[PDB]
Design a protein around this ligand. Structure first.
Ligand SMILES: [Ca+2]
Ligand SMILES: [Ca+2]
Ligand SMILES: [Ca+2]
Ligand SMILES: [Ca+2]
Ligand SMILES: [Ca+2]
Ligand SMILES: [Ca+2]
Ligand SMILES: [Ca+2]
Ligand SMILES: [Ca+2]
Length: 319
């Protein structure tokens, strides 16, 4: 009855002993990667920040700098991601994704569609503090169309609270969405954006069900997951997140590994960002929906200490 992650506070935690263990693992010409990944994946993010502070006090060195030169490749990328303070991680990923014409719309869509209003408010505040501009202004400057407008509405974090069901508004909203999809999501965009973006979660779940009976198909089937523009991808992310954030993020992990290549950036981002929120539930949806465990997919597709660390973050195999 609760959302659970795969990383919890290490019991008996001693930040000074852990700092000593990490320094021992790097001091000298060699490296003890196993010690580094076992400790860091078994301490919570808050504990990692206390280790980093004890490390600087004990040794007069910067733990993150040492990790960056001591480790390489995807393993370094994963460890560095785990060290970023949780409160800063989403804001950082958004800022990194906003790069003019090379902007990574997949990341904007993933984070903004799946974070709660409480999470989005924290993100916007943190983002201004770190980067000196508003998240909205950067998003508007680097996106276009009704995709831009939908992100802006979602960024407003003004979604109705879960309240008494109104079957009259359900039917009206479902009809409005059916008509909007019949026009390929290219007409009266402001009207369906208000529905997807500001109605309550429980309300929209009923709307989607009413859409089924009205239309004969599920609302997702109006959008081709592979051959759709940015707005359509966002609507799909919002619909899926309304149904289940763990299921949306599980599907995101699934497509990150399926096919040729591995989208390691997405693999790292989802595992780390969700490790203390809902990664256990993500695993459950992953196994239920894709007939195989997240553990087995990571194991088959990745290598070395990066794989070892990802498997420890995953926590367990599922079947
Ligand atoms: Ca090792
Ligand atoms: Ca893009
Ligand atoms: Ca894109
Ligand atoms: Ca909150
Ligand atoms: Ca149009
Ligand atoms: Ca793969
Ligand atoms: Ca290796
Ligand atoms: Ca089993």
């Amino acid at each position: 009855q609760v959302l659970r992650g795969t990383v919890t506070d290490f019991p008996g935690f001693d930040e000074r002993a852990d700092a000593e263990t990490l320094r021992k693992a790097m001091k000298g010409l060699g490296t003890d990667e196993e010690s580094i990944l076992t400790l860091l994946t078994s301490r919570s993010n808050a504990q990692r920040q206390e280790i980093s502070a004890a490390f600087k006090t004990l040794f007069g060195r910067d733990l993150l700098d040492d990790l960056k030169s001591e480790l390489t490749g995807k393993f370094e990328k994963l460890i560095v991601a785990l060290m970023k303070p949780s409160r800063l991680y989403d804001a950082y990923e958004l800022k990194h994704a906003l790069k003019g014409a090379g902007t990574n719309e997949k990341v904007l869509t993933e984070i903004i569609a799946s974070r709660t209003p409480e999470e989005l408010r924290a993100i916007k505040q943190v983002y201004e503090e770190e980067y000196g501009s508003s998240l909205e202004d950067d998003v508007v400057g680097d996106t276009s169309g009704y995709y831009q407008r939908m992100l802006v509405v979602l960024l407003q974090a003004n979604r109705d609270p879960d309240a008494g069901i109104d079957e009259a508004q359900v039917e009206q909203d479902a009809q409005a969405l059916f008509q909007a999809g019949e026009l390929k999501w290219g007409t009266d965009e402001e009207k369906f954006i208000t529905i997807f973006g500001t109605r309550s979660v429980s309300h929209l779940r009923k709307v989607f069900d009413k859409y089924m009976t009205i239309s004969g198909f599920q609302i997702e089937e109006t959008i081709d997951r592979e051959t759709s523009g940015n707005l359509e991808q966002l609507l799909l992310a919002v619909v899926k997140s309304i149904r289940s954030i763990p299921a949306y993020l599980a599907e995101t992990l699934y497509y990150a590994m399926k096919g040729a290549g591995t989208d390691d950036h997405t693999l790292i981002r989802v595992m780390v960002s969700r490790s203390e929120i809902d990664l256990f539930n993500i695993r459950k949806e992953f196994r239920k929906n894709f007939a195989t465990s997240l553990y087995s997919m990571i194991k088959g597709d990745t290598s070395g200490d990066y794989k070892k660390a990802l498997l420890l973050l995953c926590g367990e195999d599922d079947c």
